[PDB]
């Protein structure tokens, strides 16, 4: 089997992407944030504290003939950005782009933090990291991909995120028309539960590529590119007027600047992020100061190849017995 679904930016900055997901019988369609950096599929629901729901579409398990309550099970998650959510657990039929998993754990939120409430466009998350990170207790549950894997034509999914445009998540096949040149594959460590890999270096604009190992995670659920302070300082030093602002929370630059591209290495191959992808617009409405899309990972504890990086590539998440990641230009 295979599936193919379009993913769409939630706003004009590509802050996140939403993908329609069918849950239950008859189908209830919710727009979920596919997140390769976490492993819980959770939704706003009829159980979510009413005061914490503000515009989201909710899952109502009592209206699904295939919903089953997982007796006694709970879940609770905290994300890198400080947001969180928690609740109880159902299983139900879940379909993405024509691909159906029966008995998928659908984690129903009883509580969500303010950042979730305040984002009316995101109805929940669909985790695509390794199932070892799943937060269901007392017994951990499998991700949608882990459940689908054995049925897929090939044990893979691909992320093809758009810049200020829709893109595609495919399951079970590689669309050879969706990229230019060849896909370069690179080793993955699952030791921390993430799609963790080692980039072979970077370049700033037209500068010569610096060969240096950068361990990080491929994370579709993170907006920006977070890299070591050395790398990030080298980038912003090439932007006139750029500076790090502790009050704003990172590097800012004059909105009128021309941003250089940023290149990261994948083995001997190279992915070039155009300068425009690094512009996240005014720091506040009407400001002439803009927020940068490449920021320091110091204090996160891990480097993160988030949407800024991933949307410059066609990315293969290969879930074969020995997992790998593939990157191609597009």
From Swiss-Prot:
The protein, known as: Endothiapepsin
Active-site residues, Swiss-Prot/TrEMBL: 35, 199
Disulfide bonds: 255-290
Keyword Cell membrane: no
Record family assignment: Belongs to the peptidase A1 family.
A molecular-function term among this protein's GO annotations: aspartic-type endopeptidase activity
Keyword Protease: yes
Gene this chain is encoded by: EAPA
Catalytic activity: Hydrolysis of proteins with specificity similar to that of pepsin A, prefers hydrophobic residues at P1 and P1', but does not cleave 14-Ala-|-Leu-15 in the B chain of insulin or Z-Glu-Tyr. Clots milk
Biological process according to GO: proteolysis
Keyword terms, alphabetized: Aspartyl protease, Disulfide bond, Hydrolase, Protease, Signal, Zymogen
Residues of the full protein shown: 90 to 419 of 419
Listed EC numbers: 3.4.23.22
Every Peptidase A1 domain range: 17-328
């Amino acid at each position: 089997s295979t599936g193919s679904a379009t993913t769409t930016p939630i706003d004009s900055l590509d802050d996140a992407y939403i993908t329609p997901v069918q849950i239950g019988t008859p189908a209830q369609t919710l727009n979920l944030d596919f997140d390769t950096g976490s492993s819980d599929l959770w939704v706003f629901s009829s159980e979510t504290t009413a005061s914490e729901v503000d515009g989201q579409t909710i899952y109502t398990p009592s209206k699904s003939t295939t919903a089953k309550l997982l007796s006694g099970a709970t879940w609770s998650i905290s994300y890198g950005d400080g947001s969180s959510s928690s609740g109880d657990v159902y299983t139900d039929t879940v379909s993405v782009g024509g691909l159906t998993v029966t008995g998928q754990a659908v984690e129903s939120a009883k509580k969500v933090s303010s950042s979730f409430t305040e984002d009316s466009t995101i109805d929940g998350l669909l985790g695509l990291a390794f199932s070892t990170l799943n937060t269901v207790s007392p017994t951990q549950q499998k991700t949608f991909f882990d459940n689908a894997k054995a049925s897929l034509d090939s044990p893979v999914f691909t992320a093809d995120l758009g810049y200020h445009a829709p893109g595609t998540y495919n399951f079970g096949f590689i669309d050879t028309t969706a990229y230019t040149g060849s896909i370069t594959y690179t080793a993955v460590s699952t030791k921390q539960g993430f799609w963790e890999w080692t980039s072979t270096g970077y370049a700033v604009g037209s500068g010569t590529f610096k060969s240096t190992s950068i361990d990080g995670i491929a994370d579709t659920g993170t907006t920006l590119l977070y890299l070591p302070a050395t790398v990030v300082s080298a980038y912003w030093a090439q932007v006139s007027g750029a500076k790090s602002s502790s009050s704003v929370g990172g590097y800012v630059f004059p909105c009128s600047a021309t941003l250089p591209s940023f290149t990261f290495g994948v083995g001997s191959a190279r992915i070039v992020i155009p300068g425009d992808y690094i512009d996240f617009g005014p720091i506040s409405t009407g400001s002439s100061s803009c927020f940068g899309g490449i920021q320091s990972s110091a204090g996160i504890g891990i480097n993160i190849f988030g949407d800024v990086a991933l949307k410059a590539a066609f990315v293969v998440f290969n879930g074969a017995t020995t997992p790998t990641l593939g990157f191609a230009s597009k």
